[PDB]
């Protein structure tokens, strides 16, 4: 006898993790559901799931992780620490393993979706969840979060943390320092305002361990303190879980630039200590993940709640964040590619996908190498025109093929595949899905290189069929990769209706041929291929592998690719490169082209003199992977601004020494910026572009060099 209710799970959270008596290979997890009925009144549910050592290792990617390690990692949240940055992989693996075990041992769960939930009154835990037949869900309600905390880390502590790891992002140094001496969070200041649809909650704190200076609202109108007695099976006694059940909201929302992670860690740490100071209950897990918990950081901002409080929070686009939360069970971006398969399960699937392919593409996968030429490209520098040039894309093809080949190798445990398939189907219509896949596919292929190999081989097959059909549909593929490729036609450059007809016929022919080939290789697709014509052009110039510029001499539209865009200065440089290429190719020898190119460079440098003191303008973004010149401890005194540093470091050169513009308050006061250095880099890029254009349109071996030392260096030095 199990009692069933029509509910909807607003959030799935991790409450307890332990190991039952005389257990050495399997642990147990007590998982807290924030649920909501049709009326939206919140209720609290619990489930208990079991994970074996093999599942944990499979979700971890290696055999290093031990069950005893997860046990001590989850007992250690007495909430004063910040444990998940001791081993972020451990916590991602544990979260993904618990969610997989929950879907496997209790039912197909779905956030914000109608479910029928059945619990065992004797034990109190939820015993089985199924997909509800009918019922409109409650509307996911948001609350607006503003949290700002002043935390006093000694700058030399950050200096030492960065000195141990020279490429450490300073948000990670901030969090590592807070982990070293947690009292910094207790004796810090904090202002928090939480606005729901009902009332306003607000607290202002001088020492976050002392009573508030400013109060506005009660703490019992945001949430509800619930005590639920459970009887986890195989364990001696009844245990009580004390939880916070958010009234009339399901997730927080935090702004982008104002977001601070230690602020919310300190706030939730004080909430945890206040709520769980009363004895006679269980202390939840206190775990948070984000880009800021890795030394090298992480590109996409987020921070995922694993434990207390029990509900999401979005560092934002709000609709897309909610959709990505719902469609992925909230494990993304927290778990990474683990939201599809455990990494240790990717080899076999790849093998299976290889085994099901036709022998030719089998060998293509077997031999695949990144640099291997596949089709008859244009061998830059080259120029085409006046012709009819077209650009084509298979929008989202890599994600499509990954989903298809995963379902092909499914003979190697598939709810992750269903999530990936729904993402693939959703990409043609809502862009959050495509944005997710842009990060998900590379991460998946980083999980296993055999996947790179398989997917590149199938891409090679696609390229081969594109060339084959191009031969027969009046098309010569001049460049591209296979999911996006450009080429030229043999049609009269003067008849435009005939042109458009030929573009359309070629598009249909190529789409049909690629679809047929993928189908013959048994690679079935979740939504049928669409071949998008990105644009029609009349001239094209290629100077590098990905450096290409397209011009349409009849409506004056361009497209530029391969030009770095690592600052506003490079944006302006791209703009002038496209303007000057418009003029140069409208000039239809090399002498006049060089005259126009040097005029463009001179005008660029004058306009750059008009911005000779703009730090943000001349700052370039350096990634955690390029070398970066350090700076004296002065940047280490930035304070809260150090936390909004997880991937990119904007750096200027002043008079030459680097300055992380973003690490200091405003207004900045600096020596004059070394505009000579920045303009030299920018002009090196521009000379690559111009040299390619000259060698393509006129075959001149004389490269474009713009003399800077002579002629317009005096303005700065």
């Amino acid at each position: 006898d199990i009692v069933w209710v029509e509910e909807s799970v607003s959030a799935i959270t991790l409450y307890a993790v332990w190991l039952p008596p005389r257990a050495r290979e399997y642990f147990h997890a007590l998982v807290y559901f924030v649920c909501r009925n049709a009326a939206g009144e919140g209720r609290a549910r619990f489930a208990e799931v079991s994970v074996t050592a093999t599942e944990l290792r499979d979700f971890y990617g290696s055999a290093d992780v031990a069950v005893v390690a997860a046990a001590r990692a989850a007992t250690t949240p007495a909430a004063s620490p910040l444990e998940p940055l001791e081993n972020p992989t451990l916590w991602r693996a544990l979260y993904a393993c618990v969610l997989a075990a929950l879907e496997r041992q209790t039912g197909p769960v779905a956030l914000f979706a109608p479910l029928r939930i059945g619990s065992d009154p004797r034990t109190g835990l939820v015993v089985k969840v199924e997909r509800a037949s009918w019922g409109p869900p409650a509307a996911p309600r948001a609350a607006l979060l503003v949290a700002e905390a002043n935390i006093d880390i000694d700058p030399m502590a950050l200096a030492a943390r960065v000195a141990e790891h020279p490429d450490a992002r300073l948000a990670w140094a901030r969090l590592a320092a807070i982990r070293d001496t947690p009292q910094c969070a207790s004796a810090a200041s904090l202002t928090v305002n939480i606005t729901t649809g009902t009332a306003l909650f607000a607290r202002e704190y001088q020492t976050l361990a002392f009573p508030p200076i400013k109060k506005e609202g009660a703490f019992g109108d945001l949430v509800e303190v619930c005590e639920v007695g459970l009887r986890p099976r195989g364990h001696p006694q009844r245990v009580t879980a004390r939880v916070l059940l958010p009234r009339d909201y399901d997730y927080f929302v935090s702004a982008g630039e104002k977001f601070s992670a230690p602020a919310l860690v300190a706030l939730f740490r004080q909430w945890h200590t206040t709520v769980h100071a009363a004895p006679g209950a269980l202390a939840p897990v206190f775990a948070f993940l984000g880009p800021e918990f890795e030394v090298r950081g992480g590109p996409v901002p987020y921070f995922a709640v694993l434990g207390f409080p029990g509900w999401p929070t979005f560092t934002v686009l709000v609709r897309g964040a909610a959709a990505a939360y719902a469609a992925l069970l909230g494990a993304w971006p927290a778990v990474g590619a683990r939201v599809v398969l455990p990494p240790r399960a990717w080899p076999g699937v790849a093998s299976a996908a290889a085994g099901c392919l036709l022998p030719a593409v089998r060998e293509a996968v077997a031999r695949w190498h990144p640099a291997t030429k596949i089709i008859q490209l244009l061998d830059p520098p080259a120029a085409v025109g006046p012709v009819w040039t077209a650009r084509f894309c298979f929008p989202g093809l890599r994600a499509q093929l990954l989903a298809a080949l995963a379902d092909l190798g499914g003979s190697g445990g598939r709810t992750g595949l269903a999530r990936l398939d729904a993402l693939v189907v959703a990409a043609p219509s809502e862009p959050w899905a495509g944005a997710v896949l842009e990060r998900l596919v590379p991460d998946t292929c980083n999980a296993c290189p055999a996947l790179r190999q398989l997917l590149g081989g199938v891409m090679a097959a696609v390229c081969l069929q594109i060339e084959e059909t191009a031969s027969s549909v009046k098309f010569a593929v001049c460049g591209g990769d296979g999911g996006a490729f450009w080429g030229v036609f043999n049609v009269d450059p003067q008849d435009a209706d005939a042109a458009s007809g030929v573009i359309e016929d070629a598009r249909r022919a190529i789409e049909t041929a690629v679809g047929a080939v993928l189908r013959a290789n048994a690679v079935r697709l979740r939504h049928p291929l669409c071949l998008a014509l990105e644009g029609v052009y009349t001239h094209a110039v290629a100077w590098s592998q990905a450096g290409v510029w397209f011009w349409n001499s009849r409506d004056n539209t361009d497209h530029l690719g391969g030009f770095p865009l690592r600052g506003p200065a490079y944006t302006t440089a791209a703009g002038v490169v496209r303007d000057t290429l418009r003029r140069v190719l409208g000039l239809t020898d090399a002498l006049t082209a060089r005259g126009l190119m040097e005029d463009a460079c001179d005008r660029l440098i004058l306009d750059a003199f008009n911005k000779r003191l703009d730090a943000e303008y001349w700052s370039v973004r350096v990634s955690p992977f390029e070398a970066s010149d350090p700076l004296p401890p002065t940047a280490f005194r930035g304070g809260a601004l150090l936390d909004a540093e997880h991937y990119w470091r904007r750096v200027v050169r002043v008079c030459s020494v680097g300055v992380p513009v973003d690490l200091y308050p405003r207004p900045l006061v600096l020596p004059p910026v070394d505009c000579a250095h920045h303009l030299r880099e920018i002009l090196r890029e521009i000379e690559l572009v111009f040299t390619g254009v000259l060698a393509g349109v006129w075959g001149e071996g004389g490269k474009f060099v713009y003399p800077f030392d002579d002629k317009m260096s005096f303005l700065f030095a």
Binding site: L606, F609, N610, Y664, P665, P667, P671, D710, M712, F714
Partner: protein, 312 residues
């Protein structure tokens, strides 16, 4: 010939800044307009070497958010970096001055130039008029007001050709200065081709303490950038003068100082050599404006910066 020596020994290098860019260049590469103008009293940072190092330390405590004195140049709606001066209304670029006591340094936004030039200001043909007008003429702050040496800022443009000459009756001296004037303006017409220098009306300001200082405006529309360019201008004017009837180039360098007119070690006082075609009270009065004295004083559309005179 002077034409041949210019044609064979200087490599003119000029860049024509236009409109907004030229105005920005003048304002960011030449002293602020208020720095020139006489003021009721001096605002600045004036002290010996040691105490100046201390003040610089305090400023470098205040900015994180001994060539650095000349380097401390800036912009600002908010006050500049040099505002070390402790006054908000400062404008950069500033004059920076060397003083003897012990060596002292001043970074000044304003000064009482009236009191500096007041003891040496006045209320036939040209030569007789010049001879007659010429005949008719401690702490850091005080010893500032006794002598001052302008420090060359390699980061600012040059608007005045300023020659230090180290060379007798006074008749010979004055006649030689007139011939010097003709030779120097021949040189200036050669070096500065786009400008209409009238050889007998273009101001040369002569200051005598034998030691002379000659001061000419750079002809419109040029400014001169670079220590080497000014050294070349000096070499050309020396050659032009030595190839006309008569009977120092190391001063142009970043950080090098040059004694200003109306200051002692003998005090430099005007020696009026009126141009043959002037139309003369203004010439006499202008012998007292500091904008004829400093390398980097603001000039009085297109601006052709001459930034190189190459040559082995």
């Amino acid at each position: 010939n002077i034409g041949e020596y210019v044609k064979h020994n200087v490599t003119p290098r000029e860049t024509v800044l236009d409109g907004d860019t030229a105005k920005a260049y003048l304002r960011a590469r030449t002293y602020a307009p208020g720095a020139l103008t006489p003021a009721p009293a001096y605002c600045g940072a004036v002290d010996s070497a040691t105490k100046m190092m201390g003040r610089l330390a305090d400023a470098e405590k205040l900015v994180p958010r001994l060539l650095r004195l000349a380097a401390t140049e800036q912009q600002g709606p908010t006050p500049p970096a040099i505002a070390l001066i402790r006054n908000a209304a400062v404008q950069t670029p500033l004059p920076v001055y060397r003083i003897s006591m012990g060596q002292a340094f001043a970074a000044l936004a304003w000064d009482d130039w009236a009191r500096i030039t007041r003891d040496a200001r006045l209320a036939p043909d040209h030569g007789a008029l010049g001879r007659r007008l010429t005949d008719r003429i401690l702490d850091a702050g005080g010893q500032m007001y006794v002598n001052r040496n302008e420090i060359f800022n390699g980061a600012l443009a040059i608007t005045n050709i300023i020659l230090d000459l180290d060379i007798v009756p006074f008749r010979r001296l004055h006649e030689a200065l007139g011939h010097f004037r003709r030779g120097a303006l021949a040189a200036v017409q050669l070096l500065f081709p786009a400008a209409r220098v009238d050889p007998d009306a273009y101001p040369c300001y002569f200051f005598k303490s034998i030691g002379l200082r000659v001061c000419m405006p750079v002809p419109a529309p040029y400014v001169v950038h670079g220590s080497l360019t000014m050294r070349g201008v000096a070499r050309v004017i020396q050659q032009a003068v030595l190839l006309d009837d008569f009977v120092d180039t190391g001063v142009y360098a970043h950080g090098h100082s040059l004694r200003l007119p109306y200051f002692a070690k003998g005090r430099l006082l005007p020696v009026f050599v009126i141009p043959p075609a002037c139309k003369v009270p203004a010439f006499v009065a202008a012998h007292a404006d500091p904008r004829r004295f400093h390398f980097h004083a603001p000039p009085t559309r297109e601006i052709r910066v001459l930034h190189s005179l190459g040559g082995d």
